[PDB]
C-alpha cells in the first residue's frame, strides 16, 4: 500500500491524495528521495485525501520523488518482560547498545479505559523511603500522586531517590519501576540513566528516555509507551509497577506546539482546550483491577511555571490526581532535602496505605499530631522571629523548637538516605517527646504509653 501521490506539504503537515483503506491515527512511513525514512500519523482522512503529520518534520522532502506507506496500525509498542533493565527512547527504540527485543505481543499505546466496575480501589502501601511522603502523604499502590516543583529545585534528585528506594513489604521480586523522561535535557537524562546503573536499580526497571531536542510528537508519545509497558508488566505479568514521569511541563508545551501546528483553537493561556482530557488519558491509566495480581502506580513530576499553582499545567493535574507533593524554594533555601512542604501537599488515598498489617498501629495517629503541631509550631516559630523573641507562653516556644527540628531533622533526610517507615515512625515519636502530654490530644492514651519515650 505504497503511494507516490503527495499533493501538498505545509509546515509539518502533509496531504496525500488518491488513497483508500487508510484510517484515523494510522501510522505511516514516508520514504524520502534521498532514501531517508520518516514516520508519521494520520491526523485526518477525507475522501481519497489523507492529512498526515510527520514526526521528524518535512524539511528536505521532494513531494514528487517521495512515497508514502500506510502501516495499517496506530503507534504501537512491542512489549516483553525482557524490557527489564533496558533503556529505550520515546518510541521504544533501544538506547543502551542492547539487542533488539522480541515482542511477545504488540500493544496500541493508547491502551484502553479500565471498566469503572472492574476497577479495584487502590490498597496496600509502597515504601518510597522518604519520611515526608511515606508518613504524612502516604503513597498507595494504584494511586496518582504527583510532585509539584519548579525550575532550579531538586525534583531531579527527588525523582532518582524514590526510583531507587521504592519497594514493597510484599516479597523480593514482584515490584518494578517504569521511568519515563519527557523532553528533558541530555544532562538530566544521563544523570538518571547512570544513577540507575550505579545503584543497580536498572536491574528492576524499564527506562524511556526522551530528550528536549527530540521532535514534539515523540515527546507526547513517550508517556503512553511507558504506561503501555507498565500495564503489560502489571496486568499481564502481575507486577507492582511504579511509574515515574517528568517533566509534565515539557509534555504540555509539546502538546501546545502540536495543537497550533494543526490549526487548532487554543484554550486558557495558549494551551489546548483538551489539555485536561489529554492528561487524564495518562493518569487514569493507573490503579488496581479486580481478579488481577499487580498494580500500576504513577508519580507525575512537573514544574510549576513562575511557581504559580494556578497555572493550567499544575491546576489541571491537581484536578486529576489524588493529591500532590509540593516542593518549595523556602525550604530548599534552608538546606532542607528533600524540600517538601507538608502543608499544601496531600495524599487522598493514604487511608488505604496505613494501618496494622500495612504499617504499624500508630501511623494514622502520629501524622495527625505531627501535622497539627507543625501547623501551630511554624506560626509560633514565625511569629517569634518577627514579633518578639523567646516570649511565646513557653508553649509556643517549644512548638517553635518543634517546627524547626521537624524541618531539619525529620523532613531533611538527604537525597541518599533511605528512611524505612519504621525509622520514620520512631523518629516521629522522638519529636513528639519534646512536648508535654497535653498537646497530643489527637493520640489516645494507649498508644502513648506504648511508643512515647
Amino acid at each position: 500500500k505504497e503511494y507516490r501521490t503527495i499533493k501538498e506539504v505545509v509546515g509539518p503537515l502533509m496531504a496525500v491524495e488518491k488513497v483508500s483503506g487508510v484510517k484515523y491515527e494510522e501510522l505511516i512511513e514516508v520514504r524520502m528521495q534521498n532514501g531517508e525514512i520518516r514516520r508519521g500519523q494520520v491526523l485526518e482522512v477525507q475522501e481519497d485525501k489523507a492529512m498526515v503529520q510527520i514526526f521528524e518534520g518535512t524539511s528536505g522532502i521532494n513531494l514528487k520523488n517521495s512515497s508514502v506507506r500506510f502501516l495499517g496500525h496506530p503507534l504501537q509498542l512491542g512489549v516483553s518482560e525482557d524490557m527489564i533493565g533496558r533503556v529505550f527512547d520515546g518510541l521504544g527504540r533501544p538506547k543502551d547498545n542492547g539487542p533488539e527485543i522480541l515482542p511477545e505481543k504488540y500493544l496500541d499505546i493508547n491502551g484502553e479505559v479500565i471498566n469503572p466496575i472492574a476497577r479495584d480501589y487502590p490498597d496496600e502501601f509502597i515504601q518510597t523511603g522518604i519520611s515526608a511522603i511515606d508518613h504524612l502523604n502516604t503513597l498507595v499502590r494504584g494511586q496518582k500522586l504527583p510532585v509539584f516543583s519548579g525550575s532550579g529545585l531538586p525534583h531531579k534528585e527527588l525523582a532518582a531517590q524514590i526510583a531507587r528506594q521504592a519497594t514493597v513489604l510484599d516479597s523480593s521480586d514482584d515490584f518494578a519501576v517504569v521511568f519515563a523522561a519527557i523532553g528533558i535535557t541530555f544532562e538530566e537524562a544521563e544523570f538518571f540513566m547512570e544513577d540507575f546503573r550505579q545503584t543497580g536499580a536498572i536491574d528492576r526497571s524499564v527506562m524511556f528516555m526522551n530528550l528536549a531536542n527530540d521532535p514534539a510528537i515523540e515527546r507526547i508519545a513517550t508517556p503512553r509507551m511507558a504506561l503501555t509497558a507498565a500495564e503489560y508488566l502489571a496486568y499481564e505479568k502481575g507486577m507492582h509497577v511504579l511509574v515515574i514521569m517528568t517533566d509534565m511541563t515539557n509534555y504540555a508545551e509539546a502538546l501546545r506546539e502540536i495543537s497550533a501546528a494543526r490549526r487548532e483553537v487554543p484554550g486558557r493561556r495558549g494551551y489546548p482546550g483538551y489539555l485536561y482530557t489529554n492528561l487524564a488519558t495518562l493518569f487514569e491509566r493507573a490503579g488496581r483491577i479486580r481478579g488481577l495480581k499487580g498494580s500500576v502506580t504513577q508519580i507525575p513530576i512537573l514544574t510549576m511555571p513562575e511557581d504559580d499553582k494556578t497555572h493550567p499545567i499544575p491546576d489541571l493535574t491537581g484536578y486529576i490526581t489524588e493529591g500532590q507533593i509540593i516542593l518549595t524554594r523556602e525550604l530548599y533555601k534552608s538546606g532542607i532535602q528533600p524540600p517538601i512542604d507538608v502543608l499544601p501537599s496531600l495524599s487522598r488515598l493514604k487511608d488505604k496505605g496505613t494501618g496494622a498489617g500495612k504499617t504499624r498501629e500508630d501511623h494514622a495517629a502520629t501524622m495527625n499530631q505531627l501535622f497539627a503541631a507543625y501547623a501551630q509550631g511554624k506560626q509560633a516559630k514565625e511569629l517569634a522571629v518577627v514579633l518578639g523573641e523567646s516570649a511565646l507562653s513557653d508553649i509556643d516556644k517549644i512548638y517553635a523548637k518543634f517546627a524547626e527540628r521537624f524541618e531539619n531533622e525529620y523532613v531533611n533526610q538527604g537525597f541518599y538516605t533511605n528512611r524505612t517507615i519504621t525509622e520514620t515512625l520512631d523518629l516521629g515519636w522522638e519529636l513528639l517527646a519534646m512536648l508535654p502530654r497535653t498537646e497530643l490530644k489527637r493520640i489516645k492514651d494507649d498508644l502513648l504509653d506504648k511508643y512515647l519515650p
Binding site: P266, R268, R269
Partner: protein, 50 residues
C-alpha cells in the same frame, strides 16, 4: 503614642491588605487582557480565510 499607633497600623494595612490586593489585581487584569487578545486574534484568523 497615638501617632505611632496610627503609623504602625497603617504600615500593617499597607503590607497585608493594600499591596497584596494591588499585586493580585494587577495580575488578574493583566492576564485577562492577555486572554481576550488571544481570543480576538484567534477569531480574526478564521475570518481571514473567508
Amino acid at each position: 503614642a497615638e501617632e505611632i499607633e496610627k503609623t504602625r497600623r497603617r504600615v500593617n494595612a499597607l503590607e497585608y491588605m493594600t499591596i497584596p490586593q494591588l499585586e493580585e489585581t494587577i495580575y488578574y487584569i493583566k492576564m485577562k487582557l492577555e486572554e481576550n487578545e488571544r481570543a480576538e486574534v484567534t477569531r480574526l484568523i478564521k475570518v481571514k480565510n473567508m
